[PDB]
Short mmCIF file of C-alpha atoms in Angstrom, two decimals:
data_model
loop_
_atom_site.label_atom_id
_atom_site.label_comp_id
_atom_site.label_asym_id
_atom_site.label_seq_id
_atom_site.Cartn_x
_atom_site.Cartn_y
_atom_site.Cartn_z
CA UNK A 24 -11.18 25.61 -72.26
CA UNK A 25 -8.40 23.80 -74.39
CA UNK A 26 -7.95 20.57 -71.89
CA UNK A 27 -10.31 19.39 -69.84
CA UNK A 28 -8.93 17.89 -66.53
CA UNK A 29 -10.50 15.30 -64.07
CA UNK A 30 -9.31 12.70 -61.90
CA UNK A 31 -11.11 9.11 -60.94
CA UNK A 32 -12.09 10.48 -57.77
CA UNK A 33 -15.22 11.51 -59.22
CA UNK A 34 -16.02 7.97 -60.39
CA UNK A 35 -16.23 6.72 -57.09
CA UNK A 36 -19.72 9.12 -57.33
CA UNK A 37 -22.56 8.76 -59.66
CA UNK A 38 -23.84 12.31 -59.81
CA UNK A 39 -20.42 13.19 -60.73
CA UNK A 40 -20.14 10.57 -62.90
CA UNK A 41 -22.90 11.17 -65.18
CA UNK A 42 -21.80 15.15 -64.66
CA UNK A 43 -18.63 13.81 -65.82
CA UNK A 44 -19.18 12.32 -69.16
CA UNK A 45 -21.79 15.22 -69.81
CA UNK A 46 -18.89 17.89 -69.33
CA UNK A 47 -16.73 15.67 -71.26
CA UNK A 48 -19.30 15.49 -73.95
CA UNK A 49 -19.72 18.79 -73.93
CA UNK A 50 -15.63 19.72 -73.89
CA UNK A 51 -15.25 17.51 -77.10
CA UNK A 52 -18.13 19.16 -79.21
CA UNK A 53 -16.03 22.63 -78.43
CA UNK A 54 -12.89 21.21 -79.75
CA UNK A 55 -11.02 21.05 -76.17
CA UNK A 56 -8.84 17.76 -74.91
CA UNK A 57 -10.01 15.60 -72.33
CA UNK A 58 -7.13 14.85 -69.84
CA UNK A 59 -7.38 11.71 -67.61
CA UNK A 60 -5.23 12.39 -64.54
CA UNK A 61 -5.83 8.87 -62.61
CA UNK A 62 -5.19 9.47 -59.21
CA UNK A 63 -6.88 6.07 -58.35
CA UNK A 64 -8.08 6.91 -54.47
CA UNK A 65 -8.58 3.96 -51.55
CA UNK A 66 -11.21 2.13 -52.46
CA UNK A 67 -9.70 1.65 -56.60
CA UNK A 68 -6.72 -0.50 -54.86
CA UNK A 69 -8.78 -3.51 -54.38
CA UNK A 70 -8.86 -5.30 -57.47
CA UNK A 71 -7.47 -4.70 -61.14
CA UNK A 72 -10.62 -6.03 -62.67
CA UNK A 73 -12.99 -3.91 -60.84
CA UNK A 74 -11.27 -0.80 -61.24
CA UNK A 75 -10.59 -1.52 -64.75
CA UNK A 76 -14.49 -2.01 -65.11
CA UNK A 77 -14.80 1.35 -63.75
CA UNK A 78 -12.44 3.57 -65.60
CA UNK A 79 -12.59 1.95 -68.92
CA UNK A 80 -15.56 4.18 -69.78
CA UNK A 81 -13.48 7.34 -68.95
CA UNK A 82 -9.67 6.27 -70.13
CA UNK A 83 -11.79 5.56 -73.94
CA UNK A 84 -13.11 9.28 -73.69
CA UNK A 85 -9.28 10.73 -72.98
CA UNK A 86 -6.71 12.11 -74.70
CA UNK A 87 -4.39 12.76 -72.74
CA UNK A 88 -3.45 10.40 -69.71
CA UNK A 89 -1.28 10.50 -66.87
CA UNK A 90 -0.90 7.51 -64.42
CA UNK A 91 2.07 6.89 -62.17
CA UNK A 92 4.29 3.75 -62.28
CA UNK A 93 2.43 1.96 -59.62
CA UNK A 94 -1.14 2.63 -60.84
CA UNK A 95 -0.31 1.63 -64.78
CA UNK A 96 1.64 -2.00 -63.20
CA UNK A 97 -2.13 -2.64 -61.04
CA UNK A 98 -3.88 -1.97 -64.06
CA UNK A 99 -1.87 -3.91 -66.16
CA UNK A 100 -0.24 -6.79 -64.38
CA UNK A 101 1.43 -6.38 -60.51
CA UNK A 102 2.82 -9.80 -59.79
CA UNK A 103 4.62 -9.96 -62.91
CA UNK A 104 6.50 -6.61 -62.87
CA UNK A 105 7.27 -7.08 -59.12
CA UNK A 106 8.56 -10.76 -60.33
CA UNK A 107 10.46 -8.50 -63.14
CA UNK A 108 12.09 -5.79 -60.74
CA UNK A 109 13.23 -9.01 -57.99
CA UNK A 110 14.98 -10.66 -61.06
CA UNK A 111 18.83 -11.31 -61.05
CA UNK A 112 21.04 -13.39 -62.93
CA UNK A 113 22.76 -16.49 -61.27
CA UNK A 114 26.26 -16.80 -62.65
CA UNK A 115 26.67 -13.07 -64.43
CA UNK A 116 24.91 -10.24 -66.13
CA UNK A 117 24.68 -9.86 -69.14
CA UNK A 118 25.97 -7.04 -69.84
CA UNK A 119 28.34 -4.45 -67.91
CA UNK A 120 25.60 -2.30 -66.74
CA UNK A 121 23.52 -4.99 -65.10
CA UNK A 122 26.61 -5.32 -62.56
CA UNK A 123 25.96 -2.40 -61.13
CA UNK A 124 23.03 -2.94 -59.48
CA UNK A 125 21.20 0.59 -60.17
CA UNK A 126 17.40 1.17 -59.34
CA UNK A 127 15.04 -0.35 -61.92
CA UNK A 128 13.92 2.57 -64.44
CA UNK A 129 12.19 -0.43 -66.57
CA UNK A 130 10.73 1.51 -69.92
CA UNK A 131 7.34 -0.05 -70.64
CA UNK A 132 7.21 -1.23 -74.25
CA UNK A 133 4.31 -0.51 -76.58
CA UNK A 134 3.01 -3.73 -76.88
CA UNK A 135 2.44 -3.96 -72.95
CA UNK A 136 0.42 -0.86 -73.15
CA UNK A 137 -1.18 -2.16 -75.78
CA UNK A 138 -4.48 -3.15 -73.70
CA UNK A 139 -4.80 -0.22 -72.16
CA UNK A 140 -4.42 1.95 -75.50
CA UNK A 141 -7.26 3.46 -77.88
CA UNK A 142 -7.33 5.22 -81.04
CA UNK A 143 -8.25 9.02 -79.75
CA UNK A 144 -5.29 8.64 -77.03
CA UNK A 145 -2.64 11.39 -78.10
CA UNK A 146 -0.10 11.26 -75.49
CA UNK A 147 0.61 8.61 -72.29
CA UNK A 148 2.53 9.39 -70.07
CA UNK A 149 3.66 7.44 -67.02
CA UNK A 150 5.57 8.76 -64.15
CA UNK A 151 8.02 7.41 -61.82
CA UNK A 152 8.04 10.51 -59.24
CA UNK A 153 9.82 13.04 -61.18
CA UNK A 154 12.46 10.64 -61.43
CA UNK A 155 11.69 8.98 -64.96
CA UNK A 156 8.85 10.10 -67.08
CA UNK A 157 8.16 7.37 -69.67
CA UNK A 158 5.87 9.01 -72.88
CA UNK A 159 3.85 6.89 -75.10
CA UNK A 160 2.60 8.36 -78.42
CA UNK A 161 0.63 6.82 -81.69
CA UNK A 162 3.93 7.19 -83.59
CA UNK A 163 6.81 6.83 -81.02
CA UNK A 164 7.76 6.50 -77.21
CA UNK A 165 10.84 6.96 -74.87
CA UNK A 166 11.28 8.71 -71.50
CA UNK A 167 13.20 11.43 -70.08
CA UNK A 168 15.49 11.09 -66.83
CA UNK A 169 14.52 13.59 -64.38
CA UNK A 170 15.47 13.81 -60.71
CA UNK A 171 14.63 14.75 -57.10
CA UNK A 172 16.70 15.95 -54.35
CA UNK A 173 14.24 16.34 -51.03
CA UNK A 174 17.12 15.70 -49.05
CA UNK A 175 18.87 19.28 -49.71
CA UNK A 176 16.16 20.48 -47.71
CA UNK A 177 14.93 17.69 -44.92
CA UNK A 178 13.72 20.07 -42.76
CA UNK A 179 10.89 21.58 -45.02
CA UNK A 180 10.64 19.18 -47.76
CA UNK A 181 6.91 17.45 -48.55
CA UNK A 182 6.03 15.67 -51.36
CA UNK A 183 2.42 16.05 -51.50
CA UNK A 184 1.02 18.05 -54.61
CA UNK A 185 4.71 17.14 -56.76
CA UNK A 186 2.12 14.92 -59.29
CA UNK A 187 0.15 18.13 -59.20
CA UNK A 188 2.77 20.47 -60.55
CA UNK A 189 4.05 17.54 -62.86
CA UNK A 190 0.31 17.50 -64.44
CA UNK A 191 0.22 21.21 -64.21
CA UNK A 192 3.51 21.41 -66.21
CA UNK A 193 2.45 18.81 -68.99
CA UNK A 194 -0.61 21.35 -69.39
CA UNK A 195 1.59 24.15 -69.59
CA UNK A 196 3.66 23.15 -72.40
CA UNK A 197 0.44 21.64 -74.16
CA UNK A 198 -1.39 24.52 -74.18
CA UNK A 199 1.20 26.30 -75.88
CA UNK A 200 3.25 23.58 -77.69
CA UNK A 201 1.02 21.73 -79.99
CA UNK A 202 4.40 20.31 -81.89
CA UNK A 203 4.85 18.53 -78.34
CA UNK A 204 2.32 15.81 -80.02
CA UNK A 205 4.05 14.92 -83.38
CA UNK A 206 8.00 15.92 -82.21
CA UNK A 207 9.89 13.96 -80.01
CA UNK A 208 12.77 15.92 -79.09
CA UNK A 209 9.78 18.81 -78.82
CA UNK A 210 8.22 16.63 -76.45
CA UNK A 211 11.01 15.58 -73.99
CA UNK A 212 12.54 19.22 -73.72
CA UNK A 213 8.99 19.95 -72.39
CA UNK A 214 8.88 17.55 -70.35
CA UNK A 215 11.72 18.37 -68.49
CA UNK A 216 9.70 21.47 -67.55
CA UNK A 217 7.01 19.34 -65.41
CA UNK A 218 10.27 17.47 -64.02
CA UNK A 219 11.63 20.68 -62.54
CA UNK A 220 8.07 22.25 -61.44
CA UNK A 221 7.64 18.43 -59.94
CA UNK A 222 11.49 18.71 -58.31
CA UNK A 223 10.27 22.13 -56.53
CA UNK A 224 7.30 21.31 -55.13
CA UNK A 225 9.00 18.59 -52.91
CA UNK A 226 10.99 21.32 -51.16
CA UNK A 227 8.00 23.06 -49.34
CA UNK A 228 5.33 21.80 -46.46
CA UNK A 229 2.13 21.57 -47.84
CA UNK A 230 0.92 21.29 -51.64
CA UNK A 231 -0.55 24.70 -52.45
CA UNK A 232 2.00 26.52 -49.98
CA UNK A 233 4.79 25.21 -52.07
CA UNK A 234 3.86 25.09 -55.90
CA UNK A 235 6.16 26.47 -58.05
CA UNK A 236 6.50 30.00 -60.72
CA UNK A 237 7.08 29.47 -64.24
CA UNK A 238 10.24 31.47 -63.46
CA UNK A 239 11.92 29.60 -60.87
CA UNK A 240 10.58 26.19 -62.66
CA UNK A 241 12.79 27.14 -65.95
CA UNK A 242 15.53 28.56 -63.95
CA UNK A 243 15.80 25.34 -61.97
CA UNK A 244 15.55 23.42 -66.07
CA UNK A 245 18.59 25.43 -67.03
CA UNK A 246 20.47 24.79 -63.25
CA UNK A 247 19.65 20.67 -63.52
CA UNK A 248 20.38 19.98 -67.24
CA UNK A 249 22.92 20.87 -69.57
CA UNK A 250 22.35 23.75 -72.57
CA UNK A 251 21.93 21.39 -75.48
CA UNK A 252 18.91 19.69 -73.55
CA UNK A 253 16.96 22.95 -72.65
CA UNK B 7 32.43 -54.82 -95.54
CA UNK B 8 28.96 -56.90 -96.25
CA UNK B 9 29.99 -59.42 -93.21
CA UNK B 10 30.07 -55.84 -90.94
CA UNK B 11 26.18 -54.59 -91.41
CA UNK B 12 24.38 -54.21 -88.78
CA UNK B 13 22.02 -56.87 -89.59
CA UNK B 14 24.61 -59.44 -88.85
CA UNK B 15 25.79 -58.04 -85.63
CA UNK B 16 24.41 -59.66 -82.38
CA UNK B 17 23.45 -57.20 -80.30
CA UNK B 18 20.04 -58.17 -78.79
CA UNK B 19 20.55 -56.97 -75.11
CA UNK B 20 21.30 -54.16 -76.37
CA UNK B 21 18.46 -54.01 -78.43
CA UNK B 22 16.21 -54.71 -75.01
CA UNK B 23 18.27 -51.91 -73.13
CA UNK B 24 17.31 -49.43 -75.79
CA UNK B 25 13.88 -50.35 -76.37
CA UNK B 26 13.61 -49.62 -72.44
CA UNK B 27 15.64 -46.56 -72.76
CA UNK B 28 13.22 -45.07 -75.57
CA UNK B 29 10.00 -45.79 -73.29
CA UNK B 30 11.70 -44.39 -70.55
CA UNK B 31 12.51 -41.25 -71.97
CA UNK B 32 8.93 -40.89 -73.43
CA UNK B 33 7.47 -41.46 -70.45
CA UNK B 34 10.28 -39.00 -68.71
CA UNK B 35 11.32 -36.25 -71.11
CA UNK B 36 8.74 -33.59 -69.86
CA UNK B 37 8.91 -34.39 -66.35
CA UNK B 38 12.98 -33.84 -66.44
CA UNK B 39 12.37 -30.33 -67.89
CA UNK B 40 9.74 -29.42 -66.23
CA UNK B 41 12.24 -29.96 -62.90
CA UNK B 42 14.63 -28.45 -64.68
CA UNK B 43 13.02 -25.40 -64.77
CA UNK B 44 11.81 -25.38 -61.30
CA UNK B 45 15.27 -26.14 -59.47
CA UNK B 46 17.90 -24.32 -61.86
CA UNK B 47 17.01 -21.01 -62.49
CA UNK B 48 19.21 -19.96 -65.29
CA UNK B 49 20.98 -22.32 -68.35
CA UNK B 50 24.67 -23.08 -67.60
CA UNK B 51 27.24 -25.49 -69.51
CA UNK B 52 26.50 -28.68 -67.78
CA UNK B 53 22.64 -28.05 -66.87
CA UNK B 54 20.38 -29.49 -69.27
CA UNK B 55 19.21 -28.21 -72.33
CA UNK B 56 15.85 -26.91 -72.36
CA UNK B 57 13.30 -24.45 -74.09
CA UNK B 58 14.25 -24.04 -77.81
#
């Protein structure tokens, strides 16, 4: 194995724990990556601290990680983002944009990831659905705009296992991308490909029922986006 | 000229009103900014001037 893929469901076990950091162990004498796809279950919702405790162990021995918006604003700070996103300006924006009143696609800066980042960590990546997914690398950071459309379908769409096929995606293109790691441009027209494997898998009932091809994942790439960002 | 320095000016009252103004605003100056920031939520021409 190339990556090696676990979740922080198994930290909420101690067999699997110490299983855990022997596979992982293991993985890294071989040469493989260790990807960290959070996932944080029930019980990791009741306190920053605590869970922090917990996974600190296994975020130091990853990677690769993957967290979604919500998850990586607990573990970092939740009162002061939602403080953020509730903002507005009393007597006018400050610029044209900000009179619009779009959703908040806030892009994390470096130095507020800064706590939560190590020196083996290759690639971050935080997602907002498929609808932003904001990359954080040693040298560089950005995101790239994706979309979702369950409502072409409302009669069969589901969103469980989307994260799945966004994860799955990521792997994909990792596996046989390596320039995904030092390239930027590399990177985000990969990433697009987990946005449209994520965008399918929200038009099907149930997660496994519904996951997507390779095929009909780039077709949908080249439907959504223009040519000159395939 | 010479007979218009301030040394020959009588101005005492004065004098006593800003010697009460100056502990005043010692005593005063964080309290007003720290309502400042509390009750006006953004800085607009005719709030008062706070921060740096």
């Amino acid at each position: 194995a190339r990556i090696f893929h676990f979740n922080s469901e198994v930290l909420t076990s101690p067999t699997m724990e110490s299983t855990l950091f022997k596979a992982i162990q293991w993985s890294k004498k071989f040469g493989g990556l260790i990807f960290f796809d959070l996932n944080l279950p029930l019980p990791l919702w009741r306190s920053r601290n605590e869970t922090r405790k917990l996974i600190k162990k296994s975020w130091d021995e990853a990677n690769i990680i993957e967290v979604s918006q919500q998850e990586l604003e607990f573990l970092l700070d939740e009162e002061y983002y939602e403080r953020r996103r509730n903002y507005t300006p009393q007597y006018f924006a400050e610029d044209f944009e900000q009179t619009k009143n779009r959703r908040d696609y806030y892009h994390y800066t470096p130095e507020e990831i800064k706590p939560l980042w190590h020196d083996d960590l290759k690639l971050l990546v935080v997602t907002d659905g498929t609808l932003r997914l904001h990359y954080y690398t040693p040298k560089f950071d950005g995101v790239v705009v994706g979309t979702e459309d369950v409502l072409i379908t409302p009669f069969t769409c589901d969103r469980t296992g989307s994260g799945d096929a966004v994860v799955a995606g990521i792997m994909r293109k990792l596996t046989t991308c390596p320039e995904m790691f030092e390239d930027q441009d590399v990177l985000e027209r990969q990433l697009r490909f987990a946005v449209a494997a994520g965008i399918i898998s929200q038009w099907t009932i149930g997660a496994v029922r519904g996951f997507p091809t390779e095929s009909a994942t780039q077709n949908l790439k080249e439907q959504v986006y223009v040519p000159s960002m395939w | 000229g010479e007979d218009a320095t301030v040394d020959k000016m009588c101005l005492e009252r004065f004098k006593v009103f800003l010697k009460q103004y100056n502990e005043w605003v010692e005593a005063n100056k964080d309290r007003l900014e720290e309502d400042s920031y509390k009750y006006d939520q953004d800085f607009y021409p005719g709030r008062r001037i706070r921060g740096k």
